[PDB]
Amino acid sequence: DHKALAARFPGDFLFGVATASFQIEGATKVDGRKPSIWDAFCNMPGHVFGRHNGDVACDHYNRWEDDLDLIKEMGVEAYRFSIAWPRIIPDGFGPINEKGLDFYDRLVDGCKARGIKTYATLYHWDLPLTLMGDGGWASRSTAHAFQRYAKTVMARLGDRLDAVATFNSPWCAVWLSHLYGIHAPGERNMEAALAAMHHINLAHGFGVEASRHVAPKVPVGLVLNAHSVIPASNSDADMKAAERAFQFHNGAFFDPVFKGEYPAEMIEALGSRMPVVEAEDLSIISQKLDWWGLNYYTPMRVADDATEGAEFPATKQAPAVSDVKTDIGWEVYAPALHSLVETLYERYELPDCYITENGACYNMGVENGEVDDQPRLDYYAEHLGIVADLVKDGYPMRGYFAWSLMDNFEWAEGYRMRFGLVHVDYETQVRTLKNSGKWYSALASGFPK
Amino acid sequence: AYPMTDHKALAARFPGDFLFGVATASFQIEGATKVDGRKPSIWDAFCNMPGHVFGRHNGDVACDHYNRWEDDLDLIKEMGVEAYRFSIAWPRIIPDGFGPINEKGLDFYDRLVDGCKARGIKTYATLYHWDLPLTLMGDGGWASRSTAHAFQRYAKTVMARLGDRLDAVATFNSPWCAVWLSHLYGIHAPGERNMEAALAAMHHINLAHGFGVEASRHVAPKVPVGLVLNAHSVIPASNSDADMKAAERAFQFHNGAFFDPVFKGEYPAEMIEALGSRMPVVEAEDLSIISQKLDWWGLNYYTPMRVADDATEGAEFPATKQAPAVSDVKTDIGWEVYAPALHSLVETLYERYELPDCYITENGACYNMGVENGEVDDQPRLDYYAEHLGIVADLVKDGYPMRGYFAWSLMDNFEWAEGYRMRFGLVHVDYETQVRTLKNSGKWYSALASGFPK
Ligand SMILES: OCc1ccccc1O[C@@H]1O[C@H](CO)[C@@H](O)[C@H](O)[C@H]1O
Numbered sequence A: 001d002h003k004a005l006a007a008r009f010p011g012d013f014l015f016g017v018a019t020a021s022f023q024i025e026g027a028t029k030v031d032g033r034k035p036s037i038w039d040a041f042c043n044m045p046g047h048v049f050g051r052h053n054g055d056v057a058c059d060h061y062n063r064w065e066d067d068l069d070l071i072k073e074m075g076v077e078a079y080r081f082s083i084a085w086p087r088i089i090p091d092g093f094g095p096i097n098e099k100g101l102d103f104y105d106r107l108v109d110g111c112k113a114r115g116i117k118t119y120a121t122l123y124h125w126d127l128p129l130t131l132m133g134d135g136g137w138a139s140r141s142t143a144h145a146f147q148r149y150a151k152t153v154m155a156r157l158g159d160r161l162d163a164v165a166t167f168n169s170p171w172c173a174v175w176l177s178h179l180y181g182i183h184a185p186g187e188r189n190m191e192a193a194l195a196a197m198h199h200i201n202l203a204h205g206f207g208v209e210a211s212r213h214v215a216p217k218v219p220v221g222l223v224l225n226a227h228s229v230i231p232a233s234n235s236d237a238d239m240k241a242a243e244r245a246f247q248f249h250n251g252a253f254f255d256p257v258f259k260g261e262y263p264a265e266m267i268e269a270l271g272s273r274m275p276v277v278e279a280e281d282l283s284i285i286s287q288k289l290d291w292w293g294l295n296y297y298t299p300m301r302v303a304d305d306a307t308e309g310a311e312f313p314a315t316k317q318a319p320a321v322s323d324v325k326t327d328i329g330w331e332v333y334a335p336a337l338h339s340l341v342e343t344l345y346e347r348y349e350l351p352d353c354y355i356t357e358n359g360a361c362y363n364m365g366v367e368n369g370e371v372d373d374q375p376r377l378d379y380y381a382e383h384l385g386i387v388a389d390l391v392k393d394g395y396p397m398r399g400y401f402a403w404s405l406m407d408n409f410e411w412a413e414g415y416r417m418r419f420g421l422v423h424v425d426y427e428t429q430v431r432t433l434k435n436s437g438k439w440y441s442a443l444a445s446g447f448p449k
Numbered sequence B: 001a002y003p004m005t006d007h008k009a010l011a012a013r014f015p016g017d018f019l020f021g022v023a024t025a026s027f028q029i030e031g032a033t034k035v036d037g038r039k040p041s042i043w044d045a046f047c048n049m050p051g052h053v054f055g056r057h058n059g060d061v062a063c064d065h066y067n068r069w070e071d072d073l074d075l076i077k078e079m080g081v082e083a084y085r086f087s088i089a090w091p092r093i094i095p096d097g098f099g100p101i102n103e104k105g106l107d108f109y110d111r112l113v114d115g116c117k118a119r120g121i122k123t124y125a126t127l128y129h130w131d132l133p134l135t136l137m138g139d140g141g142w143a144s145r146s147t148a149h150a151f152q153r154y155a156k157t158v159m160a161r162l163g164d165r166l167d168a169v170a171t172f173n174s175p176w177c178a179v180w181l182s183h184l185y186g187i188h189a190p191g192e193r194n195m196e197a198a199l200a201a202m203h204h205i206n207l208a209h210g211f212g213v214e215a216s217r218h219v220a221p222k223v224p225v226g227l228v229l230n231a232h233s234v235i236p237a238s239n240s241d242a243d244m245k246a247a248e249r250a251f252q253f254h255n256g257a258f259f260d261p262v263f264k265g266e267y268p269a270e271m272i273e274a275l276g277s278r279m280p281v282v283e284a285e286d287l288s289i290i291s292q293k294l295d296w297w298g299l300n301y302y303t304p305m306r307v308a309d310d311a312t313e314g315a316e317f318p319a320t321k322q323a324p325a326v327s328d329v330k331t332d333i334g335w336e337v338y339a340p341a342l343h344s345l346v347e348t349l350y351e352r353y354e355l356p357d358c359y360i361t362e363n364g365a366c367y368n369m370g371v372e373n374g375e376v377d378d379q380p381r382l383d384y385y386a387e388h389l390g391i392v393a394d395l396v397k398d399g400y401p402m403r404g405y406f407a408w409s410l411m412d413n414f415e416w417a418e419g420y421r422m423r424f425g426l427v428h429v430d431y432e433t434q435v436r437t438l439k440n441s442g443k444w445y446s447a448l449a450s451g452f453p454k
């Protein structure tokens, strides 16, 4: 019941919907945009399901106003979107593409008018391909490229943006992309990943400084998919493994940003293969933030891996406890969100928290002009319940963004996996609000109270 | 009779018109990677991403040939070598792969070619020696058919400017490396390990070659066009039926993937049976384009490929494994020295295919000794040359149309995944000072080559 749920949130609570540039925009060669590492990743056989690419996506570059009208119609207060660096500075470094800035200029103006709050993400994984020439994120220069990019974007949009985040999910851009080979640019090398790790942390810090110089009134944050690490058993071995996993998967980012240091045990094992950490780096990385964003979907269950020569954190996947799974295979276990936030606030000195992503893959389509996606509605009801619990416990939860306004390109899964509150038929580009979306609209429309 | 030097005795075994040359490739020697409109190649990316190249060595400086090319040409001249084989950097000519032509890039090679003409050095240009513009990766690189058309336009652009003076042109150097080593084995840029990607690269590079042949003859019909291939001398571990059949599968996969389309207008049958379903679309005119008649072809040879049958269940075609060397003689990069494998390879190729004239376009050895007392005593490299050149002379005597030979490396340079650690040059380069020092093997090769054309 959406109305009893609404009663559990403070009157000024911020409800939003969220989106990413490469996932929805399409128009990949339009108005001066040059390729991103994801264009290359999609088009090389092997990396992405069906060799699906971002060429058309949801055609949001052309349909952006219709999509803003839809958000307004749903009565959702905030919109979180990302900015395509390949549109703004197509070669990473080099000339600014003013037509690229124009698109986000119109977008933000469109939101301003409609009373929709704007939460921009500067980097949601679409690195300009040209920067790979220098080594991509493995090169320190790429952080300075971002520094210039951040300044350029905020100089134009800073007078109107309600909030900005430098990065979305360093874990993905770092390990999943450079150690595990699953995301662009698809590397599997610890040296490359440790380089990307430090350089993305550094770029974050550069972005905070850049944004505050050109747009000092805009609250600056960082969006992280902190993993809810759960040991497989209560053994000493699994307990210690859970901590190693926490340091590597979360601590690699939270510790430099919020404590100004890398995790000690991780440095002990991996430090010799890290790039140069210069004298000022950790102070730049750990500048104070106005907010932070949590992306949460599913727990990370781990067990000790005793295999000789296993690299830190030396763990392996543990089986799910719940038997409820989404259509992408991810375990549904809401309590893990509670224990995660509790853990983070005990361990770190953190600012206000917004849930910047939470949602579920369920692939049902249209019948009778409707989409009966009850399990997605149940997923939302259950996790929002947890957020309300966290509010009751005294945690500074200020808002919530449902992941995915619409069905879109889902990275290595291509278009086969649907996360949207709004269904998209890729043949016709018709948007159909799903039942979960009608429910979320019903909840969000009562805020501010 | 009275004592005679080995090089003089050797020179007598070659016809008077035999062509001796030295060879280089753009990314290995040029440096100046961000000057005059050049944009990154897949090798700039590959070098700078940790894990791909020794020491993360890159091509930013190399031998600084872009700035020292005239000095290097004067060295060729002093050596009395008739021909120079070099490659042209697509990233300098059309920096985004497609898109605007970079006149400054063309100008460098225009001046280079004029400089060779001025010195009486014959020019053999290679259009593609692995430095694909990075921007083309956006479309899928060699996995995308569009890339063949990008090369086509590039080829036509270069030949329109240079065709009035080039003595010969080759479209590609070593399809095997650009294809399997780069897209299946993950050792060369762009470092993929995927059979679908590799088979796409295979067909589109074969197609690009054909496009390049047509393009070059369209704007420069006088210039002899060829293709440079590292054909592998496949040697079975035994005469067992299992090993003989394995050697044939190996030949089809490693050589036939390229020789059959180019010289027979078809892909190898057994290969197609195993891999055909994962190949890209082959359009109606594709094999006809690929199989245009060539004026010459180039053989790159270094070491044999020894194989035995791999009986492991499900092993991917050609399902082979490594067989042991016959010699314990190896170069500093680890490659078996076995010169007679050059003879049997050439025998085999001329029986199996109808081929034009042959030029040995690469042959040489990795030996890493440096300068002592003003000299480089690289006797084992000299011996490598003396022995392999003996085989080449044997081939001439045996009736094969071997028209020339290019020593691989003019100078020490960037050696792909090995970085600057592996030296292949006839000329030593001290990378701190950029000083060139002709090695003893280089002095020997000069003494041989100086007498030609007789
Ligand atoms: O595979 C990406 C991913 C894995 C684990 C945790 C967060 C993740 O990231 C999120 O995943 C979603 C689903 O593909 C994406 O739509 C979002 O853009 C992304 O931020």
Ligand SMILES: OCc1ccccc1O[C@@H]1O[C@H](CO)[C@@H](O)[C@H](O)[C@H]1O
Binding pocket: B025, B173, B174, B177, B230, B300, B302, B362, B415, B416, B424
């Ligand atoms: O690993 C490259 C390679 C392997 C097997 C056959 C030919 C090869 O490529 C050759 O190898 C030489 C040495 O690294 C290079 O200098 C030449 O440019 C190249 O054509």
